[PDB]
């Protein structure tokens, strides 16, 4: 009653391989980033247009920025306000 | 659901878009300041204590209970369902801690040591005298949690109309087999417990939509063959009116129990929850969503969209229209630069005229998405919620000169957030901390500590609870002291020194 | 030759303003303002623009603070304040403050703020510009060694 | 793709299993303190072909610098890869009845650590949060169609 | 009352129907759309959009 290696291991590789699969996650994310980089849907025809809109791309690209001057302009990144005047130093 | 295989498919957003518009007023309205709660007292000796809960219940929740996630669930749950629930309870399930420390000097590996509720795991020495330690602690002083309640784990009665008079609430929830057995339930029960439900609870619609956005719900089923400490069972605790005692009057009493074993069964003295409704209906317990007023409108709006694709796919070909045996066939199918196209007779090629919808369909979408802004009261054009609309002593007219009254009603849902659900949470939350006492924490947080004597709890006769944003107010009370210090000043020069004013 | 009608482009003009609605940014928005999360902040900008579908940026910037970056300097100060490295900290500042990790569960020392860093140092420059005055109205008032020292 | 975690969490404290993998060579694992004896019967590339997940590839894709080459072969003996996994999970290997929170690292059918441990050391973000859930919603999520529409 | 009458004359007249004059147009290659198609007609003024 106190889990030898080989108990663990068992139940550590149950709890893995439920996971690394095909699974409507992994699909949607990795769908995300061939929209992204503006990969070809795959309904091409040898001889038409095969030109892809870019949306997500420009949503992103203009989102980031203002993420990064918040947070980032200042220099200093956190600020640790004490809770009394004894703090102060430590803060 | 009434697509069609080679058709369009296309669904109008409506909901999603009002949603995300409403929210974020809603959190810069009772989040921006830092503050969520301010206790105001009712008479200059009560100060002191107006102080001491200001700073606790904000430690508490915001430090301690992730604040803002609660908000936020609470929040959406309320727009986007009828109504939302929080729950503030006192953690019941003590688990113990394992803690680990290195570089530390004597003093405070003895002042860790000299607890009598901790046990040496691991120490050891390193050069410079520095020290490791690896303990475990079982801690007993309690918790004061804040959870926010999926809807469809929350059972109320069809006659309630309100909280306080329900008849019959309950909260339904998953124990592992670790919890139960720190609750106290006896191994032989344990052995005998139903591992998957009695009343097939684990279907409910809520929860197969949720969790099929991204496919990651129950499609696998657990607490079979895994280890025997994490199986999981479906408990309820019910609070509700039953006569018990036998004195002829029903009380309300708090039944907590798994299975057909009841594991708790005690008379409780306050029911712990706080509801929101957004657009209330008079004398109802469950209010209107944004679905129930729009829906008609996403309904129409992505078939006449549907309508437009459908026109569009199959008038881009490009055809053309040819006499028969007045043009040469041939000629025409090599399209080169500058060919040319021998014909025996003319006005024998043209280009195929395409049917067309008339411009009804695109004023009525115009209309329709007019008639959404209408109705919701937000529009793509209307500005967002001041941080200060709920402010007494505002004054700041903004938002009344602009903020026409169909778009007011904005203002009228941050109102009843603040008037119904919030100031009972904070209500609670006050309660909770004065009823179950727990020195040393307190002072550990500000370094004093005020005695309460919590006997009239139930009359609320000391402190008056605004969960009125504390948003900018700094600058005012600010002010408030340049003009106060030039009083004293004036009073000084008077000649009032250490009779109108002392220098302390 | 046969040409397309302006059904066409039109709905294109119309699924552009339909992602423009949707993400709550456009062409035409304007960026967010570099001290948005500040409390004290005054500055009434972003509430006198930025309309309330576009206000919708302004949500992210606030859920980022609230719930991650707080928990990562939550975290980060409490591995420094666990496994203590002294002679860094000093080497650091030249000075060094003893703190017991004993408690470190409670969290009831600091507050972290991840609410940006950003420009208030004209604010308490003003405000110091304040104090030095109140300081010479005190001292000119006969208040030197009991209201005020020379420290 | 390198972070698991299981389908019931709705958040990271609550989490019942947590996974990072990782690639270590032999000259870490060495440091790390792994006998040698151990080291040569190590699997040399995974035990579950963790290494062609869909987002690994379509990243690696954009400029075909992904792993075209195998590697870890007839190299350097002390450069040769191994895939680590460390798990943060509720387990109860004391035997006490109750499951506590620990810490196991290990490559391959060794345990290299397997310790009680105080804290899950991550954090999270959700751009656009769905209350009770973990994952949230992404652009992609919400502008595919138009994207589509569009091309 | 209003609204309903405006719904029900659009939804019976967005199906894009043609009329087209019998014995003149060869049905087979109207039938068949596809891009840069052909249609062959034996006299003018005969497909057009219904009205």
Request: hydrophobic share 35%.
């Amino acid at each position: 009653m106190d889990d030898e290696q080989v108990l663990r291991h068992l139940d550590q590789l149950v709890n893995d391989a439920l996971d690394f699969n095909s699974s409507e996650l992994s699909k949607q994310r990795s769908e995300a980033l061939k929209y992204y980089f503006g990969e070809p849907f795959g309904n091409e025809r040898p001889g038409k247009s095969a030109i892809v809109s870019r949306d997500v791309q420009e949503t992103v690209d203009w989102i980031m920025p203002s993420l990064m001057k918040v947070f980032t302009s200042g220099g200093q990144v956190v600020k640790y306000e004490p809770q009394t005047a004894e703090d102060v130093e430590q803060a | 659901g009434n697509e069609r295989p080679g058709k369009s498919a296309i669904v109008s957003r409506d909901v999603q878009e009002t949603v995300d518009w409403i929210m974020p007023s809603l959190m810069k309205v009772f989040t921006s300041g830092g503050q969520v709660v301010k206790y105001e007292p009712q008479t200059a000796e009560d100060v002191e204590q107006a102080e001491q809960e200001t700073e606790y219940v904000n430690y508490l929740f915001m430090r301690k209970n992730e604040g803002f996630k609660v908000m936020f669930d609470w929040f959406q749950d309320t727009l986007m369902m009828k109504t939302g629930v929080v729950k503030v309870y006192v953690e019941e399930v003590l688990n113990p801690t394992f803690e680990r420390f290195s570089g530390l000097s004597e003093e405070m590996v003895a002042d860790i040591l000299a607890d009598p509720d901790t046990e040496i795991l691991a120490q050891s020495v390193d050069e410079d005298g520095t020290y490791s330690i690896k303990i475990r602690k079982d801690k007993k002083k309690r918790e004061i949690k804040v959870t926010c309640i999926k809807p469809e784990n929350f059972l109320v009665d069809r006659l309630a109309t309100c909280i306080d008079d329900a008849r019959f609430l309950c909260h339904r929830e998953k124990y592992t087999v670790s919890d139960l057995r720190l609750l106290g339930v006896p191994e032989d029960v344990l052995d005998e417990l139903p591992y998957d439900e009695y009343e097939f609870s684990d279907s409910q619609p809520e929860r197969l939509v949720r969790d099929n956005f991204d496919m990651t719900g129950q499609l696998q089923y657990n607490s079979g063959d895994d280890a025997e400490a994490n199986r999981e069972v479906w408990a309820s605790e019910c609070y509700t009116l039953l006569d018990v005692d036998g004195d002829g009057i029903s009380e309300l009493r708090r039944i907590l129990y798994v299975g057909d074993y009841i594991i708790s069964n005690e008379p409780w003295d306050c029911r712990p929850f706080a509801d929101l409704n957004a657009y209330r209906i008079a004398h109802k317990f469950h209010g209107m969503s944004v679905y129930d007023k729009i829906r008609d409108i996403q309904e129409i709006r992505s078939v006449l969209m549907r309508n437009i694709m459908d026109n569009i796919y199959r008038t881009n070909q490009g055809r053309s229209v040819v006499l028969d045996g007045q043009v040469n066939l041939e000629d025409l199918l090599t399209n080169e630069a500058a060919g040319i196209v021998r014909v025996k007779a003319m006005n024998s090629i043209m280009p195929l005229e395409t049917p067309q919808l008339s411009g009804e369909v695109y004023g009525m979408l115009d209309r329709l998405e007019a008639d959404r802004g209408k109705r919701t009261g937000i529009t793509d054009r209307t500005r967002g919620l001041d941080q200060n609309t709920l402010h007494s002593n505002q004054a700041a007219m903004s938002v009344n000169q602009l903020m026409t009254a169909a778009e007011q009603q904005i203002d009228l849902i941050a109102r009843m957030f603040a008037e119904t659900g919030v100031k009972r949470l904070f209500q609670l939350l006050h309660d909770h901390a004065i009823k179950y006492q727990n020195q040393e924490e307190v002072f550990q947080l500000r370094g004093k500590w005020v005695a309460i004597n919590p006997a009239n709890w139930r009359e609320r006769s000391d402190l008056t609870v605004t969960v009125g944003i504390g948003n900018m107010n700094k600058d005012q009370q600010m002010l408030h002291l340049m003009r106060i210090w030039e009083m004293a000043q004036a009073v000084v020069g008077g000649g009032g020194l250490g009779v109108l004013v002392s220098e302390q």
